[PDB]
Amino acid sequence: GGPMDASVEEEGVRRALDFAVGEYNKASNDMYHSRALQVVRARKQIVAGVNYFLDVELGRTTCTKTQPNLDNCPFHDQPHLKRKAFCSFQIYAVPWQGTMTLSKSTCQDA
Amino acid sequence: GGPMDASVEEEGVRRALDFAVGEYNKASNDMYHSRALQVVRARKQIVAGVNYFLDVELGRTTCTKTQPNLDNCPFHDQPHLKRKAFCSFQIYAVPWQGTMTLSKSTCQDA
């Protein structure tokens, strides 16, 4: 944990750089190819995380976002207010740093 | 070797779920709060990789995207065509899976 100095002298780094430049040129609206003039700084860090893959049915509750006690709030009962959705969430957790990132989320109606 | 089973009956999972739902709620255009009705499938996987952090100066070349010798040819010496950019790329690599993904990418022109 914690980025250490690295350089273009290393395989992984040169490959990462060429990949990065390739993606940059791929995403740009420029008709011209851009290329690396110089690497001003390079660092590398081994990281680990835990992916949680959750398939979850969500229900619409009767509570608005502006109010308390949402975690046990009743689900809508009335015909046109009821909304349900089946969702797939991928959460990338890094317990060492106390963070979570939502890597993927798609939802389809019930 | 794939993701292993997990369940809501687990602390990491509940936290990841709460995070996912929270992110789902803040991103939606619904005035009502949504919450989990049922987790239908829960899996988890520990993963490792290497982050490469590269601060790179790119210069606009006179070669088009549609050209041979695609990364190595003249830089624009034309007064209003010339462009240099200082970019910060974060590449997440999984060497034992031979993959790379561009997680972050930002540039500030010169």
Curated annotation (Swiss-Prot), chains A, B:
Site (Reactive site): 1
Oligomer status and interactors: Homodimer.
Location within or outside the cell: Secreted
Chief site of localization: secreted
Full-sequence portion shown in this chain: 37 to 146 of 146
Disulfide cross-links: 63-73, 87-107
Keywords: Age-related macular degeneration, Amyloid, Amyloidosis, Disease variant, Disulfide bond, Glycoprotein, Phosphoprotein, Protease inhibitor, Secreted, Signal, Thiol protease inhibitor
Secondary area of contact, short sequence motif: residues: 45-49
The protein, known as: Cystatin-C
Miscellaneous comment in the UniProt entry for this protein: Potential cerebrospinal fluid marker for the diagnosis of Creutzfeldt-Jakob disease.
Gene Ontology terms for molecular function: amyloid-beta binding; cysteine-type endopeptidase inhibitor activity; endopeptidase inhibitor activity; identical protein binding; peptidase inhibitor activity; protease binding
Residues bearing PTM Phosphoserine: 7
Tissue-specific expression: Expressed in submandibular and sublingual saliva but not in parotid saliva (at protein level). Expressed in various body fluids, such as the cerebrospinal fluid and plasma. Expressed in highest levels in the epididymis, vas deferens, brain, thymus, and ovary and the lowest in the submandibular gland.
Domain of life: Eukaryota
GO cellular component terms given for this protein: cytoplasm; endoplasmic reticulum; endoplasmic reticulum lumen; extracellular exosome; extracellular region; extracellular space; ficolin-1-rich granule lumen; Golgi apparatus
Role according to the record: As an inhibitor of cysteine proteinases, this protein is thought to serve an important physiological role as a local regulator of this enzyme activity.
GO BP field: defense response; immune response; negative regulation of blood vessel remodeling; negative regulation of collagen catabolic process; negative regulation of elastin catabolic process; negative regulation of extracellular matrix disassembly; negative regulation of peptidase activity; negative regulation of proteolysis
Disease: Cerebral amyloid angiopathy, CST3-related: An autosomal dominant disorder characterized by cystatin C amyloid accumulation in the walls of arteries, arterioles, and sometimes capillaries and veins of the brain, and in various organs including lymphoid tissue, spleen, salivary glands, and seminal vesicles. Amyloid deposition in the cerebral vessels results in intracranial hemorrhage and premature stroke. Cystatin C levels in the cerebrospinal fluid are abnormally low. Macular degeneration, age-related, 11: A form of age-related macular degeneration, a multifactorial eye disease and the most common cause of irreversible vision loss in the developed world. In most patients, the disease is manifest as ophthalmoscopically visible yellowish accumulations of protein and lipid that lie beneath the retinal pigment epithelium and within an elastin-containing structure known as Bruch membrane.
